[PDB]
């Protein structure tokens, strides 16, 4: 009576049953019944130049660690936006209506990589 505990896999079924193993599709089916692959769906790998870059995958044993402070939204605000806001308020040029000069963005859909929809994979 078959195997219930075994995972349902394309290796198990007939020629009709063809299931992917988790890869991402890169195209569609074209005019002649062939597969037309879209270059836009291909993940273009982004690599830097590592020849003129000096760092190593292992850390010196005598190099000390640090007190673990996780990055906080309050700390990021106090480090990035707070000097500009404080300088503009002490100079009298602070504008509560427009905050685009301090790094704030009202709507995400203008820019290329959104945050809440998570437009970028990695």
């Amino acid at each position: 009576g078959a195997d219930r505990m075994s995972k349902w896999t394309s290796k198990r079924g007939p020629r009709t049953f063809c299931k992917g193993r988790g890869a991402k599709g890169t195209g569609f089916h074209g005019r002649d019944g062939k597969f037309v692959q879209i270059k836009e769906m291909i993940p273009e790998l982004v690599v830097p130049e590592l020849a003129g870059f000096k760092l190593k995958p292992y850390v010196n044993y005598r190099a000390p660690e640090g007190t673990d402070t996780p990055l906080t939204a309050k700390q990021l605000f106090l480090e990035t936006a707070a000097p500009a806001i404080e300088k503009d308020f002490k100079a009298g040029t602070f504008d509560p209506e427009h905050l685009e000069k301090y790094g704030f963005e009202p709507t995400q859909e203008g820019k290329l990589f959104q945050l809440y929809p998570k437009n970028f994979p990695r």
Binding site: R4, M5, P14
Partner: protein, 46 residues
């Protein structure tokens, strides 16, 4: 003639009769799945 071989295996028939989708198209099959979950089954369906 000779008996013992009433089970002729077919994955199409198996997944169409006892499949997850076939269980969830009917409220009685849904209640079957809830009974298997209440019993704590490792495999709820095929």
């Amino acid at each position: 003639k000779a008996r013992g071989n009433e089970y002729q295996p077919s994955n199409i028939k198996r997944k169409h009769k006892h499949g997850w989708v076939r269980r969830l198209r009917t409220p009685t099959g849904v209640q079957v799945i809830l009974r298997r979950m209440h019993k704590g089954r490792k495999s709820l369906s095929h």
